[PDB]
Design a protein around this ligand. Structure first.
Ligand SMILES: O=C(O)CCCn1c2c(c3ccccc3c1=O)C(=O)c1ccccc1-2
Length: 567
DNA sequence: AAAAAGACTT
DNA sequence: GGAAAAATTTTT
DNA sequence: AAAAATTTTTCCAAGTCTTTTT
């Protein structure tokens, strides 16, 4: 039965407390390892051998990745092998001395032949598995938190595999290791039925911590960090925190000018420490850069943010581009994605970066005397709850709002307005540096979308031919009588006019999303109310922008704030 | 403090 | 999330 | 149909800021 809870109209919980009641059926473990059949052989130095279950499982993972470029890299093969030997018996360790003499060319083909027979199942054996995954979602994918049933995001644990990560990770190849129930920590209420552990096992511990959001927790062997199973974005716990993110971003708008004037005068300060902080805060505001946390050497790939930049990442140019005082940025950020931008800065910012790069080696930190802790404690003394991450949400949302007013033409149709919406949502991705939407299939599919626009251009032309025939026959065979034909064929041209201005609009839309990714900005940086306030203003239906799960996530926006909403 | 953990976003 | 995969749905 | 374009699942990490230990 259709209910629909409006958690936004309820009262908030006092400091710390996230809930009072919590019950779940625990996580879902990856199905146990099924050993390779008799005809699938593994060869070492040409000779045949059958590996034990723990060592064969680690071999399968490598065999499945074998098509890739990374399996030829030295760090990958060093790491993989250290973790492979660990999972071997004493007999195998003595025979298998190197990865190079190991032949996986028969295991890499079985998993490619097992994929063919997986995508070519019968209608009864495919609908049997579709009902097996559906009963899991029904029994494990939901939980009860405070009088209401909310959906879980990651209810299943990730199966073991080989670590890869992004970029030139120093730990690529290491075994991700299987998570057993003895590594799992269950969080729930005292008065709630504690989930029964999978037969033959026991949990690590059951705790009742109402100060936290998570239902299940464990530790990953790669980094050593703690992984969690929290609720999907449609919930109160996640949605309330999402609303408070944009509310803190609204309170920044009201103090942004005072903050901009204070750091502009701070470039002229007597302390070198206060200069760096202001120049850092300038790049966080102008270029929308990440704070830049300090990460341990060898634990993750060499990536930087703002406070972590080095003298090798910036190149100063007094001339270049026709413009003066240009700072050429060239570095790798989060997820190892290249940030390259030649941007003109102000008089005092340039002569400051020259003082920061002075008599320093290329691997030294540009912003010494500065880390993320100093910058954030400074911002907290400027406004309550302010952090460098807010400047990203602010510069995103205020840009969406003003670009929605600048790019929307009132006299246009609804499909043409979505093109104007996507142009505004493009400007936010050309700020936060979000890139690439499948450019490999986008070469053939675009040229085959163009041949379907020309196929409807002929129908409009054949309609304009039939209306010109009616305008010429309304004269020789009189009006009123035989003029009703000029009426119905004038509405046929109109039905075909906006049908073409839909197809040609979806073409310009797809061609402009080449090296742009609308996703991360659409779901994490932009205030949904700005969009709902635009949809209710121009009569553009909400489903023609947000899909089911986005509408489900942003239900707090669709109900609250009308057309008169200003960020 | 200030590393290390932990708890969330992205 | 972004990309590859699988699941649908719409073209030929 | 049977292919092909779409849409929807599915695979898998890494930042930020806070809070505890040392
Ligand atoms: O599918 C799920 O139920 C897990 C969602 C978690 N989740 C994950 C990633 C992510 C990336 C960007 C925004 C949100 C998420 C997110 O919300 C990501 O890059 C990743 C790698 C490995 C495991 C999980 C994630």
């Amino acid at each position: 039965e259709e209910q629909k809870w409006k958690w936004w109209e309820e009262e908030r919980y006092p400091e710390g407390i996230k809930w009072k009641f919590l019950e779940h059926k625990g996580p879902v473990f990856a199905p146990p390892y099924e050993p390779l059949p008799e005809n699938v052989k593994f060869y070492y130095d040409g000779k045949v051998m059958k590996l034990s279950p723990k060592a064969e499982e680690v071999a399968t993972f490598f065999a499945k990745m074998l098509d890739h470029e990374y399996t030829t890299k030295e760090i990958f093969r060093k790491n993989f092998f250290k973790d492979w030997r660990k999972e071997m018996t004493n007999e195998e360790k003595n025979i298998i001395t190197n990865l190079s003499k190991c032949d996986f060319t028969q295991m890499s083909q079985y998993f490619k032949a097992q994929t063919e027979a997986r995508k070519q199942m019968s209608k009864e054996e495919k609908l049997k598995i579709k009902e097996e995954n559906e009963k899991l979602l029904k029994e494990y994918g939901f939980c009860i938190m405070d009088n209401h049933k909310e959906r879980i995001a990651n209810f299943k644990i990730e199966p073991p595999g080989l670590f890869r990560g992004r970029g030139n990770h120093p730990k690529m190849g290491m075994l991700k290791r299987r998570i057993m129930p003895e590594d799992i920590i269950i969080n729930c209420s005292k008065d709630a039925k504690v989930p029964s552990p999978p037969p033959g096992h026991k949990w690590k511990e059951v705790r009742h911590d109402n100060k936290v959001t998570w239902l299940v927790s464990w530790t990953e062997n790669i980094q050593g960090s703690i992984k969690y199973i929290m609720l999907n974005p449609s919930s109160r716990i996640k949605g309330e925190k999402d609303w408070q993110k944009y509310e803190t971003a609204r309170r920044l708008k009201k103090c942004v000018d005072k903050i901009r004037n204070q750091y502009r005068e701070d470039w002229k300060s007597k302390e070198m420490k206060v200069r760096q902080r202001a120049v850092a805060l300038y790049f966080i505001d102008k270029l929308a850069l990440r704070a830049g946390n300090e990460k341990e050497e060898g634990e993750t790939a060499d990536t930087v943010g703002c406070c972590s930049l080095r003298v090798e990442h910036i190149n100063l140019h007094p001339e270049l581009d026709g413009q003066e005082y240009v700072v050429e940025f060239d570095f790798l950020g989060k997820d190892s994605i290249r940030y390259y931008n030649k941007v003109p800065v102000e008089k005092r910012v340039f002569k400051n970066l020259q003082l920061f790069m002075e008599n320093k080696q290329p691997e030294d930190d540009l912003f010494d005397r500065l880390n993320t802790g100093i910058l954030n404690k400074h911002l907290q003394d400027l406004m309550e709850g302010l952090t460098a991450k807010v400047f990203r949400t602010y510069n995103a949302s205020i840009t969406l709002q003003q670009q929605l007013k600048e790019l929307t033409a009132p006299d246009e149709n609804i499909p043409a307005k979505i093109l104007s919406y996507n142009r505004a949502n493009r400007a936010v991705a050309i700020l936060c540096n979000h890139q690439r939407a499948p450019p490999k299939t986008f070469e053939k599919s675009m040229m085959n979308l163009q041949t379907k626009i020309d196929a409807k251009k002929e129908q409009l032309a054949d309609a304009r031919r039939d209306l010109k025939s009616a305008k010429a026959d309304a004269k020789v065979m009189k009006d009123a009588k035989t003029k009703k034909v000029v009426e119905s064929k004038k509405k046929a041209v109109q039905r075909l006019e906006e049908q073409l201005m839909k197809l040609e609009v979806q073409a310009t839309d797809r061609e402009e999303n080449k090296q742009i990714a609308l996703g991360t900005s659409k779901l994490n940086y932009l205030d949904p109310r700005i969009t709902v306030a635009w949809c209710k203003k121009w009569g553009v239906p909400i489903e023609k922008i947000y899909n089911k799960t986005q509408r489900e996530k942003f239900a707090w926006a669709i109900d609250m704030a009308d057309e008169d909403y200003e960020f």
